[PDB]
């Protein structure tokens, strides 16, 4: 991690439950943490506890970010759907979720959402918009990398 977009992605919370019993909690009541207790963990922490354990410590239940509501709302209209309201980050997280789960049915949905928002950051980069409010924070980098390249070509062609 030297990139600041990579560090901030780990701080999100995931509703994951336990399997064993631990006599200590750095977080408070009742230092023996009973099993079948559900907590929300940061993704820097619940990413190495899902492997090291044959039974690992953490069950890693699926969130609402990839529930059937969101997976149905992005097959209807990928353009006018909010992505700044879910949390804030989508593409830096849904790559991390695929590697720890190896699901071949999510990678055929994000690869179609990404094409449909790609075709409308090339239209609006031709020099009065609401598309500064409903973009993903991974797309606001390439929007400021594209709109400041068309501007420096249209500047040069006319004096």
């Amino acid at each position: 991690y030297y990139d600041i977009d990579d560090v901030l992605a780990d701080g999100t919370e995931f509703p994951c439950k336990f399997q064993y019993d631990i006599p200590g909690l750095g977080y408070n009541p009742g230092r023996p943490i009973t099993k079948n207790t559900k907590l929300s963990l940061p993704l820097w922490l619940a990413r190495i506890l899902a492997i090291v354990g044959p039974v690992p410590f953490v069950e890693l239940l699926p969130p609402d970010m990839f529930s059937t509501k969101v997976m149905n709302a992005i097959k209807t209209d990928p353009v006018a759907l909010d992505l700044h309201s879910i949390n804030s980050h989508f593409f830096s997280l849904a790559i991390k979720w695929i590697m720890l789960f190896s699901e071949k049915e999510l990678a055929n949905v994000v690869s179609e959402l990404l094409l449909q928002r790609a075709q409308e950051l090339n239209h609006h980069a031709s020099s009065t918009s609401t598309f500064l409010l409903k973009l993903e924070e991974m797309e606001k980098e390439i929007y400021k990398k594209s709109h400041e390249s068309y501007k420096d070509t249209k500047r040069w062609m006319f004096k």
């Binding site: 999510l106 994000v110 094409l115």
Partner: protein, 186 residues
């Protein structure tokens, strides 16, 4: 540390590359001899010129001599109202291709029209009429050629050098996110 853009060419470094390709001039100072010399490193010939007899110099010298009016930039083969009409009617009857551009397509239409506007055949509504018309036909097929991008391969058969240096940081930042989904799912 350049740190401004650092991964593309800025469009003042594109008029630096196109100024290394030769054209023809009709000179107005002889300096041949009869029976002090330009001794530069990269060209080192054509000290010997005659008044009104064509020779071939590199382009960055022939903009020094136009500012003092000791030369006259000739037209290339494409700045012709008879020649650019075939390269337009090619574009309508073939909606998949790029017709043909001499790869100094946009850049040699800028440095000639601002500086050398006395040597063509009527640039008013005959050449700035076509060249803006041929940039708006061409910028439709680029926009329809991006609904079809994939994560392994692409073909862009005949594009200029300035229609690419506005299009690198869009494609290579999106196609680097379609690679990291297909190979992260495997």
């Amino acid at each position: 540390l350049p740190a401004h853009l650092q991964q593309t060419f800025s469009p003042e470094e594109i008029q630096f590359i196109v100024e290394n390709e030769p054209i023809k001039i009709f000179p107005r100072i002889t300096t041949r001899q009869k029976i002090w010399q330009l001794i530069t490193t990269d060209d080192k010939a054509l000290n010997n010129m005659v008044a009104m007899r064509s020779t071939e110099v590199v382009l960055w010298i022939a903009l020094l001599l136009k500012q003092q009016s000791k030369c006259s930039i000739v037209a290339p083969q494409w700045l012709t109202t008879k020649e650019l009409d075939r390269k337009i009617q090619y574009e309508k009857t073939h909606p998949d291709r790029f017709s043909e551009l001499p790869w100094n397509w946009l850049v040699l239409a800028r440095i000639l029209f601002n500086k050398a506007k006395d040597d063509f055949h009527d640039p008013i509504h005959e050449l700035r009429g076509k060249i803006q018309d041929l940039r708006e036909i061409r910028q439709i097929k680029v926009l329809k050629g991006l609904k079809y991008l994939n994560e392994s391969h692409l073909q862009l058969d005949n594009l200029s050098l300035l229609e690419i240096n506005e299009l690198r940081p869009f494609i290579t930042e999106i196609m680097d996110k379609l690679r990291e989904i297909h190979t992260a799912s495997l």
